[PDB]
Design a protein around this ligand. Structure first.
Ligand SMILES: CCc1oc2ccccc2c1C(=O)c1cc(Br)c(O)c(Br)c1
Length: 435
């Protein structure tokens, strides 16, 4: 049934976006004796925070430096500001405390994902996407040998097990391995859903693909409210993996009640298709995992993303049927690129405009994904149509490389978004040459 597969891809998108909320980094600072000890620290907690922690980024108290002695010279207005020396600080060693207002517990607050180990969260996302790549490359022969339903049930079981395991991970490497296996199973079930829907009904192939993409959009929408409802990442992952344990009941239908010629042949077509797929994967998995910086409220941002992406990808099929394949794809790619570039061009104070631009960029990259998926079945003849597999492999690779470019935020907060906006422009300019 198409409804069961739609619920499945909805929960898959929920699991995929769970990393955006569970790895959210709140405003943090390390343990200070004048702020977290007994009442002997005294009134005016802001003054104590100012004299105990030097200023840092965005004119805020430094999230990575603490004063060993109370610097009373910065409290008195008669003294010169920023008069403290660098030697008066310590490398934020006493352990960090986090604000429990928005999120009660996250993977950043649990394992102390801080400035010294700030690369761990993008490294965690990269490990997840590498597990996705490995699973998608491995489930092919497995599904061909053991059948699609067997590997589907095995992937569901693995998804459930790894979800309930990562919900209680005691260490960071163990959590990374659990996410790796969960991504393996996610890629397996994704490849199974794709190879099932591409030949279950099909003339109706574009309709089925648009329904699949609308099901993830619905997944985005659902996971927004799911993350808004529960504040703990453990219970979040538990209640997200429980539907997979429920869908496992359909195992065995209730108990019975090669192709390397793509590189030399059509080289221009295959490199263009792989470039567009790489661009979509890179931009999506680099932008959809850091919604905290793209908007002011992550939940409302995701809700707007979904409610604007639904009609965009709905009319995407009308555009593909009326205007063509290449022109609408190039237009969507250019629109997404220009929106993401304007997101950096607009000042950070215009939060509503930044959120709208991010939503428009996500809708544009989703429409571009729809167009490239439709064009993969037409750019290559039936003799070469593992072109779609190579395109999907290039898209993961781009997804994997996505979070790795986010490390450039040290040189500037706009560089990752600058790349996320510049890549789709060149992608559309290259796709404009398609026949
Ligand atoms: C069916 C695949 C799919 O369709 C979507 C529609 C909206 C948002 C995400 C997705 C989505 C993915 O999550 C996805 C999965 C893999 Br594997 C990829 O290599 C890339 Br790139 C993207």
């Amino acid at each position: 049934q198409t409804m069961a597969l739609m619920v499945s891809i909805m929960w898959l998108c929920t699991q995929s976006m769970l990393e955006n909320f569970s790895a959210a980094v709140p405003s943090h600072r390390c343990w200070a004796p004048l702020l977290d000890n007994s009442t002997a620290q005294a009134l005016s907690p802001e003054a104590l925070l100012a004299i105990s922690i030097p200023p840092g980024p965005n004119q805020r108290p430094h999230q990575c430096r603490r004063f060993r002695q109370p610097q009373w010279q910065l409290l008195d207005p008669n003294a010169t500001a920023t008069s403290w020396s660098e030697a008066d600080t310590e490398p934020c060693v006493d352990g960090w405390v986090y604000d429990r207002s928005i999120f009660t517990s996250t993977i950043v607050a649990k394992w102390n994902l801080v400035c010294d180990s700030h690369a761990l969260k993008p490294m965690a996302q990269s490990i997840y996407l590498a597990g996705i790549l490995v699973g998608a490359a491995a489930c092919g022969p497995a599904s061909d040998r053991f059948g699609r339903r067997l590997v589907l049930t095995w992937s569901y079981l693995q998804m459930a097990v790894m979800g309930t395991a990562a919900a209680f991970a005691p260490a960071f490497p163990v959590y990374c391995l659990f996410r790796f296996l969960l991504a393996f199973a996610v890629a397996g079930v994704m490849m199974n859903t794709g190879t099932l829907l591409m030949e279950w009904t099909a003339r109706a192939r574009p309709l089925v693909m648009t329904l699949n993409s609308l099901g993830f959009s619905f997944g985005h929408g659902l996971t927004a409210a799911v993350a808004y409802g529960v504040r703990d990442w453990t219970l979040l992952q538990l209640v997200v993996s429980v539907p997979f344990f429920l869908c496992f009941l359909y195992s065995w239908w209730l108990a019975e009640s090669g192709t390397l010629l793509r590189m030399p042949g059509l080289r221009f077509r295959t490199c263009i298709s792989t470039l567009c797929w790489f661009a979509f994967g890179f931009t999506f998995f680099g932008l959809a995992l850091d919604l905290q910086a793209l908007g002011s409220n992550i939940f409302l941002l995701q809700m707007f993303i979904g409610v604007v992406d639904i009609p965009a990808k709905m009319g995407a099929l009308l555009l593909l049927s009326h205007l063509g394949r290449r022109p609408t794809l190039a237009a969507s790619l250019l629109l997404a690129g220009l929106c993401i570039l304007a997101n950096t061009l607009v000042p950070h104070e215009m939060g509503a405009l930044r959120s709208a631009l991010a939503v428009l960029g996500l809708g544009g990259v989703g429409a571009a994904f729809t167009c490239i998926t439709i064009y993969s079945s037409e750019l290559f003849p039936t003799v070469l149509r593992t072109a779609v597999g190579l395109g999907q492999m290039a898209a993961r690779g781009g997804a994997i490389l996505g979070p790795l470019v986010r490390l450039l935020g040290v040189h500037g907060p706009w560089l990752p978004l600058l790349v996320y906006g510049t890549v789709p422009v060149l992608s559309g300019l290259a796709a404009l040459l398609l026949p």
